Amino acid sequence: SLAHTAAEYMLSDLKGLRLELPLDRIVKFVAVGSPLLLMSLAFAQEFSSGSPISCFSPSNFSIRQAAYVDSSCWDSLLHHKQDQDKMKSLWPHKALPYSLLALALLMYLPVLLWQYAAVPALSSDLLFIISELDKSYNRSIRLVQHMLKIRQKSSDPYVFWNELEKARKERYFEFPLLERYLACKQRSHSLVATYLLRNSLLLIFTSATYLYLGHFHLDVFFQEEFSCSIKTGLLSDETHVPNLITCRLTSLSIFQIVSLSSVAIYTILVPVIIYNLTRLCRWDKRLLSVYEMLPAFDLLSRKMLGCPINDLNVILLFLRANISELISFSWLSVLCVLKDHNIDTVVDFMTLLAGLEP
Amino acid sequence: SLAHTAAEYMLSDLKGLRLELPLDRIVKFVAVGSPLLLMSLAFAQEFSSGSPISCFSPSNFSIRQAAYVDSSCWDSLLHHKQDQDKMKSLWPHKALPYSLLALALLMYLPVLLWQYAAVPALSSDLLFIISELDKSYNRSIRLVQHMLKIRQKSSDPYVFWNELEKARKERYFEFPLLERYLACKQRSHSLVATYLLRNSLLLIFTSATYLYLGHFHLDVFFQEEFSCSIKTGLLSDETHVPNLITCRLTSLSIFQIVSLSSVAIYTILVPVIIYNLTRLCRWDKRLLSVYEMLPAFDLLSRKMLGCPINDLNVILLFLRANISELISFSWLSVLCVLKDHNIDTVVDFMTLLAGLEP
Amino acid sequence: SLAHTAAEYMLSDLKGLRLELPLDRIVKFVAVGSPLLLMSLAFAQEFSSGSPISCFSPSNFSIRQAAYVDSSCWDSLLHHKQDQDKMKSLWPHKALPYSLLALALLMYLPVLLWQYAAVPALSSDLLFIISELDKSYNRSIRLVQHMLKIRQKSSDPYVFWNELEKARKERYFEFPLLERYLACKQRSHSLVATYLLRNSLLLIFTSATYLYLGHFHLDVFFQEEFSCSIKTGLLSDETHVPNLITCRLTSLSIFQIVSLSSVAIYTILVPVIIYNLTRLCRWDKRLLSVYEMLPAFDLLSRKMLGCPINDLNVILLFLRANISELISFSWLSVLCVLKDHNIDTVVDFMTLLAGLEP
């Protein structure tokens, strides 16, 4: 089956970076695999089909007179109703899996755009930021051994501030590339377009699916029988039934169940992407209180003004998911205690000797 | 078969950490594989089905007159009983494997939530704890060579306590990150929600399965025959049997055996998850006696107060399964001898020379 | 076939330890694989079955009139004997492989209990014992170079006993952890329960198999023909044979051969597990004579008193199978010469220079 190859290349399972949101991953998985699951269920295994169209041939017909009967109607699904001569065609019945696979291949386009048009630049930017930030750490670790003996023999404030103010006017304190780079990117407005188009494309795809199920479906839904004609051409000069009646389709139940499953999964899926859109309409300040005290993280919370549709918002949202990898997963995450000061000076007097790590 | 692909991705077989309990693994395996096993057994291999519905056509009928007979009833399972005109439908018979596969895919949702919503944070926390603990060991191994010559030439107490009390007021004795981190996590209450929801979801799934087997099953259980009608439409203007009687279904035995197997496995499975729930309702203190003497493990047994529903309980339960990997599998596990003191001083006088290992 | 997957996970082929007895391995292999072998032989390859039920339809019947004949009896195996109206059913014939696979999955439960409820604790205990014993060796090898020059220039007894008695009152001679650990385990009585239940479970399983072959089998054993009825319902208003006679089953020979094979293999298998049970009813003292002279092995033979149902007996039995791995496979195994003394002093005078090994 081609489904094996599709799963082999499509949906088959830098160097540590998380570039895609978990909710985006979930919605991608459901929207991509569900058409494939309906594909596998409808035609294979469960319902051994054989001939999806079944007919009532007259008794006088031989073997492949009736074989022509049965084989000339599946490709010519047309209801010659007596009500003039409106041949109602039954193309949705033979087009169900075709539309399913077309929808499945259509669902993956936003992934293509998000993975080709935005991944390389974002990955390069995050590679630069991780390089500068681990350099920021190893240029700051050198302060924990300068503060193991001089930090002890002095009366608290005039060594917790005298060296801190000396470090304040010292190069290691500031991170100039950080503010300049963050400015040069926050003024940019290119990455938000990819996000908005990647969401709107799947939204309009869902709308098109709704229209497809509303127009071409919902009309032949309780009809399981139709009358065809064999002398719709040169057969007229023959002595047999003038109208081949009751071509019964066998997969009406599968038709109904796949239609209801498709409509239900998309009804339950729609609100999630709307929530994803609304995630970008506000500035996140859940933990802004602790970010304003740290030297490097002060700049992140400082540039919180104006309309929130900026590349800085997207960068921050993707950084919060990567703020706990192996090294940023530190006192930062441990700092759940200052969400409720001269006492903290002697508390961090001991903590600086506690963050020795290796 | 799609079962091959499902087994290829679903249920197919950090860096050493055990994140899932063995009993959870067993219940997951049974609840996930058993629907698949019934799926494979019911339709394939064992019972070569052919046509699951069999009918008694009149003798005058030709080949595909009777083929229409046999093919127009499987999709139209309706009992036109003479008792007005209550068409009892037989949709459970054709919906058995559909419900089976839906239940199989439904069973895996709690695994999804437990593996996406809690695994990364817990794995990061355990990575931090293992890093700090192997550092705690290699900052404590340095005491076994300071105690190879000074430990020998003194009269026992005033070198088994004089150096120990000197080590007591020494930095290597205490583990400040341990108490601060353990506090910052024991006050948290986020991880227990994932556990309780992961259990309650499978519980309500089992309840829904019971309701499904109670309402839609247990009604057509001894019925193997029903009468259908062919002139339920435009067939009325034909000269044949007015009522097509005795559409006999062939898979009644498979129906019964799969129903009984499903109900029995879930009856035998229910109490295990209840036991898993009750595991979190009490504080485990089986070996608390030996934990109170060790320096680092004293804090673990010290914070045993109040209601036991805390993230600390879950962390401890997952740590006891990981307390014997390669290094914590040491004197700790060997210390099965103090579960029944100045003599132990000369016993551990020899033991400190016995724990040289490399 | 599912048999491939079962062999892939079930029965498919620490770090050197032998945790399972060879006789237990043999009985497990025969009791687990034999149902699978009968499964593979009965239904596949050898006897191409086709339709296990064959019927004699009347000549007037068309193609699938007789197809309904043949397909409505396999699922409705009931003998409407003329002797009132005792419908004797033939469910064992269609339940043979179901009972076979149920028995196959049932046979593996004692393995599950023995591998989950006792393996981790026993493995940890043996890991501790091997660590302490190879330490016992490398703290005793240091005696073969102290005895290369002082051992030579003295008149035999007053250096073969003067140093030995000095070593007797020396720390390296005794192994305190050994006696204390052996006491703390010999007083325990938990591991013997797992052994007794693992044997009794397979014993009662064999008894249940005997009951199954005695009640449901041995009754339809020479019957290859039975008469069914088609008008056991709404067929009554039809003109055909009132009683469909001679539904002949084709797999009677396979039925008989599989029944005899199953009963014979279990008759030949029963005494082995009884022998395994009787192995624990006595204290093994075959080589106790050589164990009483060695320092560490003296304690093993010293605690031979009282009723033999103790965890010490099981530990000793599993140790005798592991006493010849790579290092305990030494002079111990070589000491087959003292099973038939001042001469041995000069014999071991040369042997201590012979056990230099590396």
Place this chain on the structure above:
Amino acid sequence: SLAHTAAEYMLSDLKGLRLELPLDRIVKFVAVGSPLLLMSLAFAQEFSSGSPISCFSPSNFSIRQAAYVDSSCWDSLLHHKQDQDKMKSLWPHKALPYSLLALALLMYLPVLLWQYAAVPALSSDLLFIISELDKSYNRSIRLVQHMLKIRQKSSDPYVFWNELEKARKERYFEFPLLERYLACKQRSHSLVATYLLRNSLLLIFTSATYLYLGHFHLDVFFQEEFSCSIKTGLLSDETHVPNLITCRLTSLSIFQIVSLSSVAIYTILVPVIIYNLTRLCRWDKRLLSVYEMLPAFDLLSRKMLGCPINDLNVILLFLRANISELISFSWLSVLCVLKDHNIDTVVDFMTLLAGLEP
């Protein structure tokens, strides 16, 4: 299926170099895989064909009289219309997949020419250029430690220009192989021929496909029935139907859908290659402003004159895609800040201490 082998060798997935453009990759993928996808869909899985030609045999015909009827027309598709005697043949119907596979194998020829006639020379040239450029870096890194102490204690201009002008008249400043090599290649005109032929070949292939669908298709598009003759030879001395009427083809819907899919994909594909052609008609100067200040990159922007059809244009286009691999992905990409000076001297005073990297 041979499709598996074709995918195994064709389209199946130096040392880091990117030799093919992403848009070229996309157009290659669509133009190569789409015929294969239509191949797999048309004949396999979806539409279980059986006999693509179906006929109406007379009732008196026996089994393989009508088998000869059905088998002697698929290979002899000829419409003996009464309108003299114009036998219209139906060879497109049996030639659809043959033409599909021929087109699929034809599409890959431009890839063959582009991969054999231009890849080795271009790869060697880029290997030489990467060797000389990483040498250019490691002969320029030596300037960041000569400027760590002498760079500090002087009044800005007379050390930011005195050493720079001394470095200006110093060997490390210039890259003689660069200008000489770039001249020796920019005067060459061999590589542009491969590009233009690789595009024009697929263009004329698309034109030929359009002609094929315009002449041999679009004529038998609504015809599903034709009359053949059996006595078109030695059958004339037989008593049967003089003209075998109504040979109905079953795959008309597949014919129509594959034709429309092929024409639509090529209509949507045509403009992309035209855009690729127009990419080479202009000189790219988007970031020429920053290239004119750098020493080595000044020569790249200096030779921008005359008609743009040169090998230098192709080399530059393939270099811009490779300008961000691991080392050229540096301050170059970071230099997004000078696209909107004595202040920059003190800004780069700090930046030279910021580009220490390892």
Place this chain on the structure above:
Amino acid sequence: SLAHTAAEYMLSDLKGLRLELPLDRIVKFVAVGSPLLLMSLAFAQEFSSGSPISCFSPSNFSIRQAAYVDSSCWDSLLHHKQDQDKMKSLWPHKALPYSLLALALLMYLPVLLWQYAAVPALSSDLLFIISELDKSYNRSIRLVQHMLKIRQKSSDPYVFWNELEKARKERYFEFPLLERYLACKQRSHSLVATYLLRNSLLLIFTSATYLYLGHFHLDVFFQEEFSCSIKTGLLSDETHVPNLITCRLTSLSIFQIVSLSSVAIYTILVPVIIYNLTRLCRWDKRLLSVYEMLPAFDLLSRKMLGCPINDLNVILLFLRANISELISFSWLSVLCVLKDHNIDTVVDFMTLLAGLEP
């Protein structure tokens, strides 16, 4: 097929030791694979069987009247000859592959006993012997550098014997563990029992196969036709043929060829195992002449007395196959020149400088 699994586990392809003789390997391979080869050839591929029993039904019989005819005789192979009423049964025809697979599984029992009851002890013994022998080499290599300068400046005999006689009364010359171990094993008589039983078991198996082919075969060998009866029960009250004549079996040629192949392979196989038995009835002294001069190998040839049925004979036979692995494959194998002395002293004067190897 189960043959794939059997080959996967049975016959599918310490740490260098050769524990099984090549002739034993050959006879095992032929005796184990030949039944499997006949199994694969008889039923699969070559002769597409279908129905191994074929019957002549009367013309009036319908489809599955004759299907009952054909299906009720394969399981009821009984010749109702007119000669009273001796029903000759034809069970060998349906029991051929059953007996084949039983014989195949029976052939492997001697391998089981030889691999479980003797392999561990022999492997441990050879591990000890290889450890002591490579120690014997590296305690003897030290003589080739003591004899590089003192060996040169002396008049031959009084340094080729003066040091040799000094080495003669030196510890390195003798190997005490060798004579003591060899005595302790040569007096033992346990391993020869395993060899004799492993040969006698296959001998009696071959005798049983001969009896099986002599009694149950050779009687129905030219009979291809037999007459059965359908009214051997409740069929008597029916109007049809009183005796169903000429049930012709189709696999008589396969029967004959498999019987002849089986008897021929065992006739050609019998003498080899007799030769293997006779191998142990004599003491091998082909190269005893060179063994009596070497120090360690003198003891091997010294204990050649009495009846040859001893464990020492088996140990020597398995050692001669392992005497050329990597180190014993040395001058030993090179010493093919002393099978046809003061001249050899100056020949080995140069040879000791020639055996420097690394």
